[PDB]
Amino acid sequence: KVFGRCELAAAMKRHGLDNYRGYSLGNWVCAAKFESNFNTQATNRNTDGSTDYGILQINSRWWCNDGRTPGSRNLCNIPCSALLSSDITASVNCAKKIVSDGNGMNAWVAWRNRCKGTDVQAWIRGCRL
């Protein structure tokens, strides 16, 4: 599913991501924009052989099981395929664990490089939330 901008903001809020660990909704929408362009089915293969999955490009080295990342963990206790669903519940619940891991949203390199320090409120501007 490719979400609309406000549609995704609303879904993220419904799932308790808004201001989670102090990160406003615009931060999460911005991260999703640059990680997946709001596409739940996004996948990308990393140089180390791990894969990133879903709207927030969650990585199989630590967070989910895909059966093809040697030496990896599955800390969210989910198949990576769950992160591709039109229902963002699994992605949100896993993101909550990731952002609580110590480095906040810096865990998403694209958030650090493209969202951090910017006017992230622009991502939820106009949205009925």
* Phi, psi dihedrals of residue 31, rounded to the nearest 5°: -60, -45
Q: Which residue of this chain has its Cβ atom nearest to Cl ion in the complex?
A: 26
Q: Which stretch binds Cl ion (CB under 5 A): 7-15, 23-31, 44-52, 88-96?
A: 23-31
Phi, psi of 15, rounded to the nearest 5 degrees: -90, 10
Which residues make Cβ contacts (< 8 Å) with residue 64, sequence separation at least 6?
53, 58, 74, 76, 78, 79, 80, 82, 83, 94
CB of 34 to Cl ion, least distance (A): 7
Q: Can you tell me which of 11, 20, 23, 26 binds Cl ion, judged by CB under 5 A?
A: 26
* Closer to Cl ion by Cβ: residue 36 or 86: 36
List binding-site positions for substrate.
101
